[PDB]
Design a protein around this ligand. Structure first.
Ligand SMILES: [Mg+2]
Ligand SMILES: [Mg+2]
Ligand SMILES: [Mg+2]
Ligand SMILES: [Mg+2]
Ligand SMILES: [Mg+2]
Ligand SMILES: [Mg+2]
Ligand SMILES: [Mg+2]
Ligand SMILES: [Mg+2]
Ligand SMILES: [Mg+2]
Ligand SMILES: [Mg+2]
Ligand SMILES: [Mg+2]
Ligand SMILES: [Mg+2]
Ligand SMILES: [Mg+2]
Ligand SMILES: [Mg+2]
Ligand SMILES: [Mg+2]
Ligand SMILES: [Mg+2]
Ligand SMILES: [Mg+2]
Ligand SMILES: [Mg+2]
Ligand SMILES: [Mg+2]
Ligand SMILES: [Mg+2]
Ligand SMILES: [Mg+2]
Ligand SMILES: [Mg+2]
Ligand SMILES: [Mg+2]
Ligand SMILES: [Mg+2]
Ligand SMILES: [Mg+2]
Ligand SMILES: [Mg+2]
Ligand SMILES: [Mg+2]
Ligand SMILES: [Mg+2]
Ligand SMILES: [Mg+2]
Ligand SMILES: [Mg+2]
Ligand SMILES: [Mg+2]
Ligand SMILES: [Mg+2]
Ligand SMILES: [Mg+2]
Ligand SMILES: [Mg+2]
Ligand SMILES: [Mg+2]
Ligand SMILES: [Mg+2]
Ligand SMILES: [Mg+2]
Ligand SMILES: [Mg+2]
Ligand SMILES: [Mg+2]
Ligand SMILES: [Mg+2]
Ligand SMILES: [Mg+2]
Ligand SMILES: [Mg+2]
Ligand SMILES: [Mg+2]
Ligand SMILES: [Mg+2]
Ligand SMILES: [Mg+2]
Ligand SMILES: [Mg+2]
Ligand SMILES: [Mg+2]
Ligand SMILES: [Mg+2]
Ligand SMILES: [Mg+2]
Ligand SMILES: [Mg+2]
Ligand SMILES: [Mg+2]
Ligand SMILES: [Mg+2]
Ligand SMILES: [Mg+2]
Ligand SMILES: [Mg+2]
Ligand SMILES: [Mg+2]
Ligand SMILES: [Mg+2]
Ligand SMILES: [Mg+2]
Ligand SMILES: [Mg+2]
Ligand SMILES: [Mg+2]
Ligand SMILES: [Mg+2]
Ligand SMILES: [Mg+2]
Ligand SMILES: [Mg+2]
Ligand SMILES: [Mg+2]
Ligand SMILES: [Mg+2]
Ligand SMILES: [Mg+2]
Ligand SMILES: [Mg+2]
Ligand SMILES: [Mg+2]
Ligand SMILES: [Mg+2]
Ligand SMILES: [Mg+2]
Ligand SMILES: [Mg+2]
Ligand SMILES: [Mg+2]
Ligand SMILES: [Mg+2]
Ligand SMILES: [Mg+2]
Ligand SMILES: [Mg+2]
Ligand SMILES: [Mg+2]
Ligand SMILES: [Mg+2]
Ligand SMILES: [Mg+2]
Ligand SMILES: [Mg+2]
Ligand SMILES: [Mg+2]
Ligand SMILES: [Mg+2]
Lengths: 124, 145, 63, 209
RNA sequence: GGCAGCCAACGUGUUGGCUGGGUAGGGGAGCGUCCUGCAUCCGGUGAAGCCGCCGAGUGAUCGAGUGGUGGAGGGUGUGG
RNA sequence: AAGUCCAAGAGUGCGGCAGUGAGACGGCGGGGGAUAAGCUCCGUGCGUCGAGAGGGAAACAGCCCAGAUCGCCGGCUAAG
RNA sequence: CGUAGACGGUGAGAGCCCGGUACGUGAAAACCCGACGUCUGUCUUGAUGGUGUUCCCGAGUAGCAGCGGGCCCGUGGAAUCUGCUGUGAAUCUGCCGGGACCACCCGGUAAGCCUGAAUACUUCCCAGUGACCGAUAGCGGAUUAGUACCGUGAGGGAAUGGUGAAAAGUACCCCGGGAGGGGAGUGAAAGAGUACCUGAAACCGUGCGCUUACAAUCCGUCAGAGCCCUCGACGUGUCGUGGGGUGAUGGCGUGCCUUUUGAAGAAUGAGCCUGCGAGUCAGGGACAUGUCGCGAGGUUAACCCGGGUGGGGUAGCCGCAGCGAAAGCGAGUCUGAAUAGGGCGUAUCCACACAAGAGUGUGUGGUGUAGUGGUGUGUUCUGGACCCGAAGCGGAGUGA
């Protein structure tokens, strides 16, 4: 019972080659080089799927800091005051507030400053 | 009505063969052998120890000889006569072979292990002293061949 | 083909009624004068083979 | 303990045959008779498959070229396995596939299959298939059709009865076997098993002692 | 929010608690290929193969979902 | 004597199947060396790498933080 | 219709279209068989068991020795068989063998010769079959195949199948010197045109869409503007639980495999694609573990009868008693002078006693003891034994 191993062999080839479309060079033409590229591609996708949540938090913090300093307050004091006030909006939607409607951001900065110690450098 | 396609092996009967060296998912590129050495390609004989004197060569040969003229006996204990013969009676070698107490063509010696209670007439190649006392103290008689 | 028993090991090892494999202690064939009798008599009779060697001796005995 | 009526080709019945329960009322054993039929078909497997190893293919004696300096892979002959035309490595060689199951395993599988047919009224006894002196597939087919509607039937007949086996041999679903040759595979194929009085009595008497 | 391994409780399929990086290596359970017993189904109103589209599965992979090409054999179940 | 105890997935005994028997650097105790070596040889219920992904040290197996079941465009922190 | 539903072919799956199949019938001649006669030979100028001695019973042989060969037996205490050399008998109250040798007993009758059956094989012929291959497979050889070719020679030794159902194989016209094509026809199809079934990938073009000439890129991944296409909705261009293509730009980012303490490594291997290329099989082998049958039993091997996978086959093998070097004894046995300790053995557990807390023993009762044969898996033994690789060794030959 001899088998011709070509029906089964071609399946993963087609999978990997179809996944490797758009690759510049011979990484989209040859099954071996495309497979080598797919290894890196899926590890990189895992890595960046994990770090995307940090990149977006970085972006939100940067936008919030700029808007806060426009409102004449530092970012760190702003979120310290928001923690003190009990207003518990995350940095994502706090960035949507900074961009879309700045009046609510101004009011929220007012609340954060009102709920902040009379001396932030006091020994307490 | 069971047909040929209704037949199935008993659960747990058939195990799958371990096909080895068929990828890195299971057992690949070494087929469970690890890296190089003698064992990576052939084997080691079971009587090899690395060149030190083996276990079968540093120990003395067991003392004695074999005595090709040995007289071996197939042995029945007296307690089995009770079970085999609920009433006793005459009990030779060949009507003791039928009860599966000895092999078919061999010398038979009777030993006195269990407890014999029935009236029996035992004939055998040889007897034990305890067996003879048990046979005759239970009311029967024992004769050698 | 039927397996072959290792002959050098059969004339050295033996099994008891239960099935443990026994042995003969060494250092008792010559050069005996300087050995005290306590050493001489702690060196005779059989002794059961070690559990570490029981695996290879079994294969040599059954072949 | 079934009591199968014996039926004549005229459309009548003559008598009945008692089926001993130690022989036709056995609890079936799926695993056991799986093993028995698998062993049967293993004995049927003509294992006449063969290849040529590295040393059996034609040629190959020479070392193809010098072992060093040529800038090529080290190759020991042109009939090595990796070569085209080279020898097969672990390829088939002829095999005997029969395995020898114990006698009472086979016998028990027989009894279990026949009991399985008996519990469901798939056993029939007949005086004979067709009125003698001449085979006739037409009349034997009509009688067998009255006797059963299913597709496959075993027709267990004594070896001397040739007129009967001739008249039923060319029916597409009908398998003819002798009582002393009865096995579990043929009875599990059949939807019905059609004995003759002589063959049923013969199978009973071969197992009555 | 999803999965899985070990264990426990009622109880008899759930829930709960712990745990789930990994080479040599050990164990378990599976995907795809071909040949076959038995059973069923599909196919010149177009099988296989190939090329796609649109999808699917935790993985090998799947598509008795669909088109193009093609021109005669295939699928599925349960064993070997 | 307790602790842990829906776990350490711990000990011990018997058996089936192993791989391993070239280790590396760092902390502490030492031999050799010139109280040299990214040297060499030992000890260590010492660590990490090997066989370890992620964050820090510019980059930087072995240093510091921390042990990756998967997903999230949530939050709190560690070294820095 | 069927004693024929084997298998093929015929324009696609045919028992009833063809060849056939089941079943019957047929040989002039040659050859192979028997059978009956001529023929050939022998036996009967003759049979039988007795009663008492002499002769005969395979000679340069047996035996013996030296040196060898072969026996399970490697010179050993070494018989039996046997070669070369030397020496060398008896004819039956002889001689040979029974593992040195001797005695007694037993078996036989060397140095003369023929001999069927049961056993081994297949160049060749006939008929079949395959959980065999299906054109890089199977024979080296589906085709010029031991061919072409390579070598002085022994010798080595390839590659090459598929139009269609049927050649109906493209008349005629046009461009071209032809090759090749374009119309027209043939055909079910010419995405079947004797470069011919299907026609994948590598590789090579052409057309369109997006992008790209201030930019240091393991060539990806995550975020992402702009453009292009498509599916919905409202409507008539802008959103939407959308989907594709391409991507300016920004963050992160040191190939794969081997082998290493450690390689992106400037260590190895790999130009690319397609096809191929490595733990297999045999065995009552060994050990372990599943599963099944029978169970103190379990099972047959050769073999015999079955057009079968079925049935007989008790020879053996394993379990059933051990201790001992052995004679032997036997729930014991060995050692020993020891009712004196220890070794091994008496399945295992329960209780009740009697003795010591030096590790518990002894005994009376009870319970009662599990193996074996198929077969799957792992490992192993003997085999080329997971696959590939030397320099070299031997035999017989070819070459000045
Ligand atoms: Mg792209
Ligand atoms: Mg197998
Ligand atoms: Mg691996
Ligand atoms: Mg690999
Ligand atoms: Mg292993
Ligand atoms: Mg290697
Ligand atoms: Mg090594
Ligand atoms: Mg090793
Ligand atoms: Mg060996
Ligand atoms: Mg040495
Ligand atoms: Mg021996
Ligand atoms: Mg001595
Ligand atoms: Mg002394
Ligand atoms: Mg050769
Ligand atoms: Mg080169
Ligand atoms: Mg060679
Ligand atoms: Mg070949
Ligand atoms: Mg049989
Ligand atoms: Mg859970
Ligand atoms: Mg894990
Ligand atoms: Mg974890
Ligand atoms: Mg592994
Ligand atoms: Mg398929
Ligand atoms: Mg099937
Ligand atoms: Mg059909
Ligand atoms: Mg058509
Ligand atoms: Mg197929
Ligand atoms: Mg179509
Ligand atoms: Mg199609
Ligand atoms: Mg299978
Ligand atoms: Mg604790
Ligand atoms: Mg744990
Ligand atoms: Mg553990
Ligand atoms: Mg070493
Ligand atoms: Mg070392
Ligand atoms: Mg070290
Ligand atoms: Mg060092
Ligand atoms: Mg130091
Ligand atoms: Mg030092
Ligand atoms: Mg150092
Ligand atoms: Mg250290
Ligand atoms: Mg390593
Ligand atoms: Mg790390
Ligand atoms: Mg570690
Ligand atoms: Mg620290
Ligand atoms: Mg914080
Ligand atoms: Mg800090
Ligand atoms: Mg046909
Ligand atoms: Mg004579
Ligand atoms: Mg010799
Ligand atoms: Mg000799
Ligand atoms: Mg002769
Ligand atoms: Mg060929
Ligand atoms: Mg082809
Ligand atoms: Mg060839
Ligand atoms: Mg020439
Ligand atoms: Mg036409
Ligand atoms: Mg067509
Ligand atoms: Mg072509
Ligand atoms: Mg073509
Ligand atoms: Mg520019
Ligand atoms: Mg730069
Ligand atoms: Mg980028
Ligand atoms: Mg970068
Ligand atoms: Mg190296
Ligand atoms: Mg290396
Ligand atoms: Mg190095
Ligand atoms: Mg390189
Ligand atoms: Mg480089
Ligand atoms: Mg190297
Ligand atoms: Mg290279
Ligand atoms: Mg090849
Ligand atoms: Mg085997
Ligand atoms: Mg003994
Ligand atoms: Mg002594
Ligand atoms: Mg004792
Ligand atoms: Mg069993
Ligand atoms: Mg087994
Ligand atoms: Mg030579
Ligand atoms: Mg010459």
């Amino acid at each position: 019972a001899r088998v011709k191993r070509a029906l089964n062999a071609q399946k993963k080839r087609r999978t990997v080659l179809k996944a490797s479309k758009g690759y510049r060079g011979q990484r989209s033409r040859l099954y071996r080089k495309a497979k080598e590229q797919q290894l890196h591609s899926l590890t990189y996708a895992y890595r960046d799927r994990r770090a995307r949540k940090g990149e977006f938090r970085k972006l939100w913090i940067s936008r919030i800091n700029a808007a806060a300093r426009a409102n004449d307050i530092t970012y760190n004091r702003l979120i310290q005051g928001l923690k003190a006030a009990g207003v518990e909006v995350d940095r994502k939607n706090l960035a949507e507030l900074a961009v879309s409607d700045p009046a609510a951001f101004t009011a929220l900065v007012d609340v954060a400053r009102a709920a902040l110690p009379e001396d932030v450098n006091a020994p307490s | 009505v069971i047909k040929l396609h209704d037949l199935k092996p008993a659960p747990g009967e058939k195990k799958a063969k371990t096909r080895v060296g068929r990828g890195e998912g299971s057992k690949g590129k070494t087929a469970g052998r690890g890296t190089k050495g003698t064992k990576a390609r052939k084997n080691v004989p079971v009587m090899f120890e690395g060149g030190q004197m083996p276990i079968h060569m540093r120990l003395p040969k067991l003392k004695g000889f074999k005595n090709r003229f040995r007289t071996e006996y197939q042995v029945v204990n007296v307690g089995d006569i009770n079970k085999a013969f609920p009433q006793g009676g005459t009990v030779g070698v060949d009507e003791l072979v039928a009860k599966g107490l000895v092999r078919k063509n061999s010398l038979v010696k009777v030993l006195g292990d269990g407890k014999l209670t029935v009236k029996v007439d035992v004939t055998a190649n040889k007897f034990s002293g305890s067996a003879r006392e048990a046979i005759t103290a239970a009311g029967g008689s024992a004769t050698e061949l | 083909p039927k397996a072959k028993t290792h002959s050098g090991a059969s004339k050295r090892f033996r099994r008891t009624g239960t099935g443990k494999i026994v042995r003969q202690k060494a250092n008792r064939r010559h050069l005996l004068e300087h050995k005290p009798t306590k050493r001489t008599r702690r060196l005779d009779g059989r002794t059961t083979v070690s559990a570490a060697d029981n695996s290879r001796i079994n294969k040599l005995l059954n072949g | 303990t079934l009591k199968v009526d014996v039926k004549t080709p005229a459309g009548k019945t003559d008598g009945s045959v008692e089926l001993p329960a130690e022989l036709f009322d056995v609890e079936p054993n799926i695993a056991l008779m799986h093993q028995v039929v698998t062993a049967q078909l293993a004995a049927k497997r003509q294992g006449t498959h063969s290849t040529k190893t590295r040393g059996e293919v034609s040629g190959g004696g020479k070392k193809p070229y010098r072992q060093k300096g040529t800038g090529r892979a080290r190759q020991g002959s042109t009939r090595a396995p990796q070569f085209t035309g080279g020898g097969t490595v672990h390829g088939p060689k002829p095999r005997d596939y029969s395995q020898r199951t114990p006698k009472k395993m086979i016998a028990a599988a027989l009894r279990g299959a026949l009991s399985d047919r008996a519990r469901n009224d798939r056993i029939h006894a007949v005086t004979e298939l067709v009125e003698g002196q001449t085979p006739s597939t037409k009349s034997a087919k009509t009688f067998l059709g009255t006797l059963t509607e299913n597709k496959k039937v075993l027709v267990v007949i004594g070896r001397t009865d040739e007129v009967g086996a001739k008249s039923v041999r060319n029916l597409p679903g009908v398998h003819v076997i002798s009582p002393d040759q009865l096995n579990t595979y043929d009875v599990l194929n059949a939807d019905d098993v059609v004995f003759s009085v002589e063959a049923l009595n013969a199978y009973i008497s071969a197992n009555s002692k």
